[PDB]
Design a protein around this ligand. Structure first.
Ligand SMILES: [Zn+2]
Ligand SMILES: [Zn+2]
Lengths: 5, 137, 136, 6
């Protein structure tokens, strides 16, 4: 999972 | 029977936010494990797997089935104090609980101000550029 | 920053209900000691010194300056579970606190139904008297 | 103090 941007 | 604002501290409330979560049995990032890790489901049309920690407000998307939500919380927001909470909700003292809710409020504020700072700086870039363009000709 | 419904569990909220309480320094039933004992000030025009236990809903008036509020609570409502609470509010566990709030809700209902019983019986008395008058 | 009545 990755951060939102 | 607890106030709406405190519900997110309860595991069962957090689980119940997961409406149409795609990763179910067979997967490591199930609703049960997302909720155990602090996440609630904040889907959009755009970002249908969007999840956010109720406590530190970190927002993560791009979930994969083998993702262990706790490890993902650790990696992406290691300062989050909810990660330190060892006791069950009802084993907390009110003093402990109130200490926690204060840190949550401070996290919320910090997030909101971090957002304002980025929006401002973006507006400042637009204004600057437009002034520069004018001074050119 | 706690919900209005739970404020009365906080000593400082209870103290603050005492607006124009007449028994201040020198007296045994001060605002500090009333609040420590569970009471909040529920004055009326009629009953200006009226106080009620936030937990068992017992209502006492006719306060005298030497009255020890805790002894008064014990005498007048000995079954009240708030009296058993030894720990400070913040030392309670949430489980303990929630157990307590559930008892408070049951006490509230019991009180409301005791009041309804008293109103019903009073209406019945009026009906009775009026029928007796009419038979004569 | 005393129980309140009506
Ligand atoms: Zn977090
Ligand atoms: Zn009481």
């Amino acid at each position: 999972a990755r951060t939102k941007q | 029977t607890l106030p709406p604002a405190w519900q997110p501290f309860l595991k069962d409330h957090r689980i119940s936010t997961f409406k149409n979560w795609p990763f179910l049995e067979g997967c490591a990032c199930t609703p049960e494990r997302m909720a155990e890790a602090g996440f609630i489901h904040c889907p959009t049309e755009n970002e249908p797997d969007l999840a956010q920690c109720f406590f530190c407000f970190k927002e993560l998307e791009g979930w994969e089935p083998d993702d262990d939500p706790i490890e993902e919380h650790k990696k992406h927001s290691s300062g989050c104090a909810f990660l330190s909470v060892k006791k069950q909700f009802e084993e907390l003292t009110l003093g402990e609980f109130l200490k926690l809710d204060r840190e949550r409020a401070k996290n919320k504020i910090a997030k909101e101000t971090n957002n304002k700072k980025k929006e401002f700086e973006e507006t400042a870039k637009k204004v600057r550029r437009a002034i520069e363009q004018l001074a050119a000709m």
